[model samples]
Target: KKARMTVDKDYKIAEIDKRIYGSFVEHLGRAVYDGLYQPGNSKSDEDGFRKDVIELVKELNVPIIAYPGGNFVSNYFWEDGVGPVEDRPRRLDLAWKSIEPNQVGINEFAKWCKKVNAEIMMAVNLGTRGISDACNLLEYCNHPGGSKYSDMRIKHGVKEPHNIKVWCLGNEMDGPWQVGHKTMDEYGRIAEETARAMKMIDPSIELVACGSSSKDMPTFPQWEATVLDYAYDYVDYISLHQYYGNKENDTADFLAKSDDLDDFIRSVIATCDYIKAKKRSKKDIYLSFDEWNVWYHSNNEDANIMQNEPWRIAPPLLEDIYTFEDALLVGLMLITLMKHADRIKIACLAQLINVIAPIVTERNGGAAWRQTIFYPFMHASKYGRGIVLQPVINSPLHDTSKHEDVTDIESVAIYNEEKEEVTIFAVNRNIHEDIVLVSDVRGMRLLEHIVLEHQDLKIRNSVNGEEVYPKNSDKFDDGILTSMLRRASWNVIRIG
Candidate 1:
């Protein structure tokens, strides 16, 4: 197979947001306890955080991380997780069927984030809690001094305010599975009022309102429309959550889901515009794809564990061992997000460790290791900054079960003018044939080509060893970059 593409320095998508490279860390499973904070372990530091895990996360260069919940936040109480650890209440987490020990709380998480050089994108409990609680939490985190909540922070030992900049109004309120789930109107009114009050307490914070849980939700575009209609004036962005699965075991069809993601983003953007016109508003609401990843690996096992052993503290849950194919899909999804960088300003990779995450840790002070999906995310975070350039491509197409004329080569280019470098991220979806790409670099010199390929799609990485990683492979000269992308591979081509 043969493919060709052109990247022009003048044609641009938008300046990329560093927060788009963000990831999430919820209080579920071992993500908080054994994964990030192992108090008595030899590998743990003075703060009870795993040094190994911190090193791995720092390599990804994630700018911001959503904290304290996924579904877990719906019924969570902020008061239980703060203050002196011995006095904190141990409650039951209804979202995950786990016992909440309250060992690692807001103050601890803030301290750990400082060690890793990342900021917090905090989420409030809108399900069981209401406006006053949201205001109180904000006041505790951002307020300097003088008031009740601010003084409480001082009494708790964190004299300086956390000053968290980004706040989420709630998480996935449209799903019936969520606790205190509400209809569009109910959630809209509550979210609007909550955002309104929180902003009054800390006018500097940016708020994100909840949208549909997934594109396939019964109230998808409608959910966005109705919610934004009520909260548009106060919120800075709306949230989006999506997860891909290969339960059907079809590689071609699975890879094509990136097109579905693109369509979902466009539809949501349209809905936001419609609401803007209706309200006669001048501000354009951006997007925060807060929850996303491939999350069907341990379905049966997770169901068995949660049902058979309920109320266990820090139980191993949502541990999806990723394979080579899953990494390919992740790369494709990252490309899709960059293609829509103009609208999607923030995104989180569902999780950071132990829960369908790129990095994983063994329980009880064992070693930490990177999963197969870690490399693509790490590469994108390191080099995918600066402005996203729109690529003009002429590539051969192949047919899939659901998508017709799917491009065999899916790619995007990022040009960093400050560094005088241009990076092209591409994927060869063709499962059988190697696609040779010839690119016109437009007055630039080819630097190097990095390829991620594996003969076995089912190959996985483990604590013992790594089966998948990036390799340097390229041939370039005369202002033309040429490389043969292997069947089912991720490629990064550089020019300067």
Candidate 2:
């Protein structure tokens, strides 16, 4: 099969926000305890954080990281996690059916972010907690001194405020599965009031109100519209959380799910614009896809752990052993996110460590290794930092098990004007045949074409060895960048 693509400098999407390369680290399962913050491990630093994991995170070079909760924050008390660790209270985290020992709190997380060269995208609880609690956490993190929470931070040994810039109102309040889930009206009122109050505390901080859990939710577009209607003037962005899985073992169909992702993003953008028109406001509310990844491998295992083994700190849960096929879809997802770079100001790849994460650390002071999904994110984060010039591509289409007319080649181009460089990220979804992508670039010279492909779709990576890795090969002669895209391969082409 063959595909044709054209790129011009004049036509472009918005400059890609570096925060779209952000990741998430939640206080769930091993993600917090043994995953990233393992104490006394041989590889741990003075702060008791795993240095190996830290180095791996630096490899991706993410600018922002959402902290302290997926669901854990909704029932979490900011006060309990502050002050002296010895004096910190132990509360039951009903969100994750776990014990919150308060060993790692906002202070500790802020310190960790500095270690990894990342800023915090803090999330506050609106489920069990209210507006005051959100405001207090904001003050504790961002306020300098002389106030209640800010003064409390001085007493707690952080003389300087962390000054976190972004805050999330809540997580997945529209889903019945979420703890203390509320109706659209309830959530909207509380989100608005909370955003208003938190902004009053720190006007510099950006607020993201909760949207629907996933596009599959019955209240998806309505949830977005209603929530924005109440909090439109106060909040800067609406949060989105979506995860994909290939339980059916159909690679073609699973790869096509990025199409669904495109539709989901555009629908949310339309909803935001609709509310903007209704309110007659000039402000444009952006998107924060704060939670997204492939998350089905450990569903049954996760349920078993939550049922039989509850309240254990950092018990392995939501740990997905990602496969080569999962990496292709992850690459596709990254391209799709870059395709919508105009409005997707921030996005986090769910949990960053040992929970459907790209980097995995062995328990008991072992080794840390990269998963199959790590390569695409690392590549994109490193090279996807400039203006995304929209690519006009003519490609072959095929039907999947569930999706019809899915493109065989999903691709995007980004031009870094500062560096005078251009990058094209492409994924070939065809499982049986290789494809040659014929491209016309007015003025560009190929630097390298890195491709990640594995013969076995089910092959996974672990500490023992890397079964799937990218290698440098391909041709880009003259102005036409023609190269063979292997079937089911993730390719990154760099040109200058």
Candidate 3:
């Protein structure tokens, strides 16, 4: 078991928040009625969403898509799928049980995040609803005029106002299978009075509070040290939900569970810097790794279909059809959240078309594809973007019943200063040896290596495919670049 690597690029680690490679769209199972809305089938979308899952989420350029619900946003009902659509109201989506055709809400999720350019991290319903239903769903998605939920969003014709600027004060409110579950001083005093009454009704919105739904919760880090001791100075970021599994198929301890997600992001960055040096603070609470993925294959038929029908709509819960060692542990948990690009700013991946997803669909048929955790979360959300270049590796270790020693070369780096490009996202958890990497390129100046490699360490891509996954290495096209990373691999290099 040998592994080693190097790349300096002058250790930069704090600029990669392209919504931290965001993605999550949970209205649970058939992730929004047949994965990305499907009215009048035949691959609909005249406002029914699903132009073949919006061109496979615009070929995984996702951008930012945290919406609707997870655990169906703790029993969501932002006025049951807004206006018309036969007066919307078929309710009972108690977090993935089945039948609730209220037919997509919040103006069809802001017209499918404006035809998939994406940007809408909205989630509000402090479990069963309160704090004035999170200030009337943030004054009905970032108000713009004539009050009353912005005149019910201009009588639901969406009179321009999905000014949604990242909100999620609830969802997994200290989960006990959350459905309004609270405790951690009852969800940190109702998520600090619903984020100070939804930022006093949209103070140019930006809030997220509800941490520790993972880090092996058993009340992890005392549930994020008691929900940031009640949202330390009115939240700016705090929420993390994880999921990782091999169900004992142990692919070398499931690619070293990203070394227990880098010790759970350095123990939530020392509990958000010991609550910003014990509130002698000066604001800075970032880290909204929203929710992770690679869930255990449909956990017991999604818990016997949510315990035998508990609330329905697009049932067929938590569809975990991903496998290729779940895309090498989703590219080593996105290179362990881009090696903690400063307080892990906003990550999602939990649900994106069909639960436990990476783009999958076939239930009404246009057979949408990609899922071997969608090519390392679509090549780190298309070249993990600017500045986060902190790669200095020296590896060799293995033993994983959920991490310990576990290091076999997992890397991350990107310096794209407007396409002067330099990306390197390696992963080679030596399941059977074959790693030979070596690159020094420190203060950045290299100019070529566009590898993409993936050759069968358990290749996958189905729905009757023609995509056997592997190829994109112009043989280094006259610019020094070696090879042989097979074993249990995933690599993406490009140092333009």
lDDT of 2 by residue, 1-496 (tens): 8799998878898899999999999888788788888778789998899998889999999899998778888888888888878889888878778887889898888888888999999888888989888888888878899999899999998999999899898888887778889999999999999988988888888999998999989988899999999999999998887789998888889999999999999999999999999999999999999999999998888888776788877778888999999999999999999999999999999879998899988775668899999999999999999999887999999998899999999999999999999999999998888999998997656789999998899999999989988788665778988888999999998888
| lDDT over C-alpha atoms for residue 265 of model 3 | 79
Superposed by TM-score, candidate 3 places the C-alpha of residue 468 at a distance from the truth, in angstroms, of: 12
Q: Which candidate model has the greater TM-score, 2 or 3?
A: 2
Q: For model 1, how does the per-residue alpha-carbon lDDT over 373-464 read when each residue is reduced to its tens digit?
A: 99999888888998998868999999998899888999998988898988889999988888998887775666788888998999999999
Q: 65 in model 1: Cα distance from truth in Å?
A: 0.1
- Taking all chains together, the TM-score of candidate 1 against the true structure is 0.99
TM-score of model 3 vs. true structure: 0.35
Poorest lDDT segment (10 consecutive residues) of candidate 1: 473-482
Instruction: Give the winner by lDDT: 2 or 3.
Output: 2
Poorly placed runs, candidate 1 (over 4 Å): none
Show the colliding residue pairs in model 2: none
Note the Cα lDDT for every prediction shown: 0.91, 0.90, 0.76
TM-score each candidate: 0.99, 0.99, 0.35
When superposed on Cα atoms, how far off is each prediction in RMSD?
Answer: 1.0, 1.0, 19.3
